[model samples]
Target: ESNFGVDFVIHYKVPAAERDEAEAGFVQLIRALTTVGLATEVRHGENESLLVFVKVASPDLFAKQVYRARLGDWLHGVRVSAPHNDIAQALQDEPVVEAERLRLIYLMITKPHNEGGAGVTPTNAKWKHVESIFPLHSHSFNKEWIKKWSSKYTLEQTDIDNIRDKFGESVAFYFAFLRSYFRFLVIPSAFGFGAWLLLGQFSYLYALLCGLWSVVFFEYWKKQEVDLAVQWGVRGVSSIQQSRPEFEWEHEAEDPITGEPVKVYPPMKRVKTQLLQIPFALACVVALGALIVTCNSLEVFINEVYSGPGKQYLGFLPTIFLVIGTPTISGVLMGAAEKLNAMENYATVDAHDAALIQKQFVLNFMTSYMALFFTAFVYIPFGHILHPFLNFWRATAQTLTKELPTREFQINPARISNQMFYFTVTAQIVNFATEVVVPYIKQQAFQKAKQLKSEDHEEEAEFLQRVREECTLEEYDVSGDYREMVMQFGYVAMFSVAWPLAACCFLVNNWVELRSDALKIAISSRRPIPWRTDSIGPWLTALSFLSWLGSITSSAIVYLCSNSSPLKAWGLLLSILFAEHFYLVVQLAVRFVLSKLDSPGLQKERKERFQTKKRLLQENIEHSEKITREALEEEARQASIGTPEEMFWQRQRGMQETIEIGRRMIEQQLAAG
Candidate 1:
């Protein structure tokens, strides 16, 4: 049998490639488990190593660990009050939600002794053979969750609450962001249709509408993020400082504020290493940018200059080159980002991940926006300078054949719309393809083909097979998922000026994203560890960053690609400068206005926390009043931190600044025909 009513299955593998020395590691591993006061039940894996099952029961010792988790949560402010001394009453009070139960256990087993976890993390070098640590499916709850959502076309607020219970806040937050974004898209969706029907692309009025819309949506979402967090009791979660097992610290110092022991890795050194991103980004530009421009230049050549027999076939070649090169090049860049982030030796796992994501976002921004930046800034605006690329293409063509066309290339303003169209309309399939389809292929082959005598008896075998297969399941990554939506928004904000229907397209795009993501969590993958996240984390800064750039790009796209109009240096400069000012002013205005409003969710949080506040001891700062004061002040401080204060600073966080170098050339030269 694979498992009983267990909390987690830690699939420890002694890889065949590195076989029974893993036995030594495995023995040391289980010994560590008992030292941490966990009783482990070993099962036959029918392979190298074995499947160890761990769970919590109300037996004094094990249940105390579970109770410790509840108290940990209560103290951490995830729960309103401490558990009653009676175990039966404790169960009735908050009622053990499964993910929370499983999540607490997972945290215990994986967390280090210093912070109360067992230090058995997958990333920890000592646990290199620890293949999987996850909770199994509750088919009854999961299927019903799916079916319930399936029956109703609309997702009510309660549906997300249920999902929060089933999954975790971090999982639910993405859905919240997506849902908010989807509904907000309705305004732009209507505007896009009206604009497409009545006016057209390059309409400055439409550009102005979208600029305001981007600011409003982004501002509203930031507030929405806080509202959900406040409702979820997710704020003040910032206090839990997490450490990566790999963190290499020079010294341990006491925190000036909290007096907690803090690891000292001189930020000056890390920040010094952080400057390596300058060259790292340059490498990205050189590798992907050059690669993209070459393929794009050749495309223009093949499309216009070559009168060859395989006209359609050759035109397809540039896309082929791009399709292959982008993944491979960006993959290498992504790997380097992971390496560099590890090198930075961030103080906490959150910092490490946050830094890692920032690195990946740069690479993502480059590859996604490079083609459009080139098209809008260089190719569309400055037609004359592109002659070099054309000449280069021509020289290569001349060698291939004695005869070549005398045709002069003309600008295709329509091509800009087509590119945005790809990102908007067709990009959904690609996103969904890898997300759902790739997993399906792997799932069927991996699980079905490799059923390692897992179980012999009918139902136990059926159950065991599912449990065993789940061991190899890939962990769901929130960063990559968030990246997809952020990039989608970037297209809406930036290049949608060139394509009036982009909003309608993305409005449709995110609709299915809701279902797909829901299905992904419930059906496809392991139940993701529902670590508490107060908001969408770094992506909030990222969204504002995208929104900020969209303003710049939208202004430029409209001016440069204006219909049936000759571009003027004076007008372009005036347009660009004015819009730049308008963006900052509007961001301030929108941000200021949104702050004046109150969130019902946050109101609920304050009310309940206050209620819980009064139920406790007489007001004094020993332990009783400290909880009350801490809760109130923490709420106040988080509120007072200023709206997207970091986003504004990270406004400087924007990596590249051709700073409209393309616009620089466009202002002085270039035309649209």
Candidate 2:
């Protein structure tokens, strides 16, 4: 029978001369494990290495571990009870590991100190002597799961649970969120398609519908994220995280409440560093914004007013420069942001990521949408006023070449539509090729080279080859992957109105994106260290804010940017102000509706948890009352009779009283004489 057990090996290395000293350190490490209830068996490993194997010692305790895991899930609003099939077997059978062992052991070992894990960080404290801690790789087990998941026609909740079981909750939550979001997108996609056919391009009705849909989608997802967080037992998890090992602290003090040693830095000093971000952020916007304005002005001059040589080629120059220059500028800004983040001295990885993401988002939003902002509100609406100045400059500049062309300098309203089509279609294809196809091709080539190199050295040990493969795998970083999707979402929510069909294109892209990302994370990269998170962090708010911007942008595009708008300058301004107010009202209404709706699974889990706690509280109160009653009855019984000691003391007190009476009489007689 398959016992379904898992083990982790701790490889420790020391100089040959320091073997005795290393032994002492190893014993101390065992003592640490003993406190956390883990037993270690030691053995000789690879040349001069000491290996420690961790295994379960008690079957009853292992069963309790399984029971407690189930109970924790219940309390966290994940489930109310075991599945129907497991219910019968659960009472009769001792616990057996059904999932991969090293995965479970990893979670057990890395859990917080209070949660029964040793909390040993191999690079920190006394454990720094340890070389590498890794679990046995199960080739067959991974292949089974990989095949099972890939063959499925559609993703299900079970798939998410399987991912959680194999990887960790943090990774599982991301996949779960995408699954939910993708399903929700079907509604808007259907509506968008219909609106595109019924209402022509640049139709006001289609724009309004898109804006409302964006608001609803954003609000609904916010509620769904909360439900998932509660279900996964990671709600408000950031508060419990330990300081990053790399963090530097100015002082250490005991927490008054938890009594744990906490590292601290002066809050005032940290705040000062944080305040410096504003100036840096403003500078980034100014630099990027000026570049955009200059590009836009040049494009308009070349296309509309200038009769200069190579005007045909000059039309593509702005786009080419934008495509090349934007990413280069963004890279420099991100480098500066990293330096700023380091200067701020965030004590946790979470804090550092949050700070960096904030700066990146600002820069990204500017680069992604600044051109559209100018085109819709400035270029198209008031282009006639800006055109004359460009025409005058061009006429003067061209005086030496030939007579100025009498061609009318009118900005084309259709240019906005053309740009939108190019971005939604052409840019997407380019991004897909760059992000997915290019990397995949390079990875395959690298693997082929490694195989050829290995063939050249047939005498190399198989174990060494396996080690090489492990070392070559990329370390997982979910932040960059997440930001890409979030920015894609921003594009759909904030600016898809320029071409309604963009939403349709995006909906199709996301379906493939979901699968491709999963495949990449599972196969292309190293397994990510299982981390806990309650939500997607600040991106939730970013989406909501972008949706609001989408409403205003869409309204302005329909009401002012198009040639068919009947409103004059003041009327156009008044119309957008009214649309803005309407948007605010609709957004509030959608948020309220979603807030009132509840997930039934979440509701049931919370109810069951409450009942369990309530029963325990009642039992505690009754036990306390019974103890009080027993104590009172004992007091009454004792008072009903006096002991011999009490009687002896009473008789002695009476004799002393009689002697006092005689002494007082003698004193009185003497006084009278």
Candidate 3:
């Protein structure tokens, strides 16, 4: 390197899939170095890696301690461990054995006998070329690509579809739908547990918890959906896209002179569109309310009195029949709400979905549990009036009235107390059995069946022949594999509160689950696309959503079912409704509020980014201004050597041209360098 030159060398390994990307990054690094009179050269390594040799003035400053930082000489040497050591990690790392072992086992089984062990040699050694490598980072390229694509394509269609395809629909939808749902369960469970312990079935606590759980869970899920959408890189996808087909535009104006295509719509149109949610929610609440009320009343009447000859047999039939229809009717209303929300044309797709969800949550809360029915049917009407009425009817039929003296017929409220306790405790257990245990067993059985079938020599040969003649078989790295499995289990532990013993179960399951899931991921799932993104991306949003849901569910379940009073019980219900409403409103308000919130960190980021842009802009502006100033001085100096008038005109033209040329040269130089 001479007086002013740069030779920047970077040597790093990249995954096979990202070979080209790594090379491009090194090339860009070279251009950046060369801009300040530095020279650069790059060499490819044996592995999927690159060695960049940059020659420049003062290479020591350019080196700047690449391999060493204040804390250590290696990124791995840093002692910081995973956040939230014991409890959080325990929950997340539930599965015992990560499933990675099976992948290596399969690889070994297919190896040729010639290589010392189960010795599978990869055909042409292609796969062996690069066993594994870290991915290259290309932030500038990604940023530029996003900008260029946004300019050419509609944000909603292109970006949303891209994300949907990249991450499967089931995965995306669950994050969208249930992120808040998981969190919401906490509220109801807490409330239900409290009521079961204290009030038992004698009060409304159990029913309240059930109702509140449903409502809070639904609300929390909605928020999580939005947060996940943002996390997964589709946060503003809808807004960046063209308006929907039905979006009404107004007041088209034309130029008086040269006309060009123009479109006009009020900027405040989104606010106006938001009003549609009011009618949609109101319509759903009224329609579903009427359906629930009518169905409940009919069932009550038919079961209580409508039969003469078949009275005894038909007594309990009406309620059973009506139960079958509730979910169906609710589904219809939700479908309608979905349509109405879609029609609203929100400024963002997430906003549209959120509006639809808010409406459904209202309708779902109203019909799913007729809070009025649990009060009217179970507490007030049944306890105060109907049980006595039932006893008298039975007495008249059986002729057992002669033995009664004057004993007061006390309401045996404890009759239902034990039932409530059993239901509260048993329901969750049964649900877990169905949701977790049963499915896990089924998955294992199916996998075993598939494995057994393929184990036959003929079947194995048939399976292997389709894609290749030979394969590489390697033993799994047990230590790395185990840690990988544990990390995955940690995810499950952190999220699954569906079971009360989830914590305990997670502690045990993580011991195995962590290892098992890892093995499974390695063997079952495709080699995970080495994904890199800041934060947990959408998953964190989903967790937050779930947390909020847990809050609401807990409150409603605990209070409504626990309290039995004319005013207090109703007040609890009202309070839950108000809380849910407040959460939704607060979320909506934050969307507008937080965009303006201060971010000292982001400011620093901008300073870093704009420093480069500012330098370029300032250099161009100053260089242009200086050319003119220098030309005037030059003209004064040249007056003695030329005709003064001619010299002045010539210098002025030359100066202007030079300035313009200089601007172009600097801009291109920035690009080229």
Candidate 4:
């Protein structure tokens, strides 16, 4: 520690958007400047990107140190193959060859030390740097992989064809499953459309079919998710990680049995705080409902009689504005929901993440449903009736068109079905292109620039010195990898809506999701520690909730649009409410049953662990008994032979050593397992 001296000097550079990509670049550049001998340790400049200490051997190098020490961003300098939007170059001093080598070695060793390197035991080395090493996205877990890949599958690898056969078989069968689902749904949707056109808006048959289709698809997906999770052996990996260190504890109490440290928090307090959600939920529904109703009323009046107003052709203006604002308001509510979740402070980060997602689902559902209802009910149903009535009441007949009719009429229910169909099938393609293709394309372009620079610099380094300069090249970016995998996640979660046959989508998407995610893990991101985990941890809970909500919403939307009735507008609205309830009940019941069915996998795993523990315990007991008998015999023999208690003690020491071997073996097995 005495080798370096300085005060605290901290430096920050770059805006938030570009910081991730640039920070590491800045660090490398600083190292490069030092390696050139242009800057010395004593001349270190201190700023947001530079840290000052009591004394330091280098100043420019200090900038790199401080840069490395900065925190708060997830995936900081970790660039994926996609455009990470994190990298930017900064110029700085470099260090000598030996010093830079040491730094590089230090950086590589910073990963889990047991993986084979000098363990830079973090926090123990320097308390301040502990926060800097915080793992990004610790929530990403490997779980439910086995059920995803193995069920209803055959991995026939007789030769190269065997590998090809298994690989292609996995992919082909998955998509085939998805394609079958869509193929199957053609009947229900087509039949529903036919019934609507022939029988009118609320034909019991069409409504019933739509409702059943939604429920069946949801239930099937639920089962498939389980099967997939089980296939992947990722059913319950969320509990493996430690909870946030910041989780406030009410008490610390050690158990006499385990002698392990325990920090306890009051669950009742969190529960009570969480109970506040009831009022919040009610308030949200009331506020959004009232707002939507008011908007619908205004829309009705303006379209009906306000023809001579400043905006004659602007009848759809208000609705369009509201649509634009929905996400904005939802975001604000989501932020509040996040804060509330954090305040509740469940025991683990997984619980907190779960709670946050649940809160968000409420906000999203209310916002989306209320908006959809506004269109389906108040606006679509009553527009004509309210329009004519408004002209008569307001004496604004001149503002209204002379041909405006006072009688009521309904838009075709089939139109709604058509819209839903378009949104699911056609819209998915657009969303996929925008969300995945666009980002991916942009990332590739950016990565190439990075690629060029790194290749260019790498070439420069080769020419300048025999040893390569420690410069960050675009190849270090992980943006592409993360983007691709996340894009795949997007494909599964978002596009599943396209087909009622989507248990097939569920199957195929999940099947590819594991390997694709692993590919990203292997190539896109850092090598994650091989830890025993299940599921993606808390995200699975959120996904489950989302799937449940999506089922209800999608069902309601499909039914409302496809139903036939004279009061089709009002009828559709009512159908949606009913759909929500039905979807909820079906999903809840089916999920519970599936969970019961899936319990055997967990039970089997538990039995194995228990048997291992018992066997170890039995072995230890037998060994102890044998040692005790041996000691007694040795003591009596020594006494009989008049060798004295000292001789007996020596025999006992050797026996104790022999017994210790079994205990060590038991401990090693436990540790390894």
Q: Model 4 has how many clashing residue pairs?
A: 80
lDDT by residue for model 2 over 1-673, one digit each (tens)?
1112435556677668867888788887777666655568665454566656677666566556666655554444444544224543663643333333344455566545775566566646555567655554455556666676667756887778767665666677777767766776676677677767886766777667777777777777777777766665456665555566567788898766556687878879988888898899899988898788777777887787666577888799777877787788889999999988888888776877877888888888888788888887777777766766576667655655536564567778777777777667677777778766777788789879867965324433453444344435566667766676777776666667667777787767767667767766645665665666777776776777777777777877777655634457776667578767777889889978876876753685678668877876998945755554655555556668645654443342334465887898899999999
Ranking by lDDT: 1, 2, 4, 3
lDDT of model 3 at position 510: 31
Candidate 3 lDDT by residue in tens digits, 233-313: 233232322223334446666633326444455656666866777776677667666666555444434344333455557
lDDT of 3: 0.40
- C-alpha RMSD in Å of predicted model 3 compared with the true structure: 22.1
Query: TM-score, each model?
Result: 0.85, 0.72, 0.36, 0.49
What's the candidate order when arranged by decreasing TM-score?
1, 2, 4, 3
Question: Model 2 off-target regions past 4 Å?
Answer: 1-153, 248-259, 264-273, 301-316, 385-408, 451-467, 564-567, 601-605, 621-673
Tens-digit lDDT track of model 1 for 2-104: 3357778888877876566678888877777776665687776636647788765445665666688767666767654567878757867656666577677
Whole-structure CA lDDT of model 4: 0.43
Cα deviation in Å at residue 84, candidate 1? Answer: 6.5
- The pairs that clash in candidate 1 are 111-117, 111-119, 650-653
Q: Candidate 3: deviation at residue 151, Å? A: 44
* lDDT (tens digit, per residue) of candidate 4 on 1-673: 0112211112223345656555665454345434432222212221223321112345555444434422211113211111222322221221222222233333333433333233333334322221121111111222333333345343322321221122222222232333333344455546544664576543444444544454455455445544444333334444433455447788898844436676777668977997998877777677556666556555555554343545556677667866766677677777777777777877664577557656655655555446445555444444455445444545654464544343333443433344345444454456446544464566567567745865225343332221111111112222223223322322223222323332333343433443443333322332222222233333344444544445444445444433334455565567556755766676577667766665544454466557757876998956876666776777767667546645646543445686887798899999998
Model 2 CA lDDT for position 551: 73
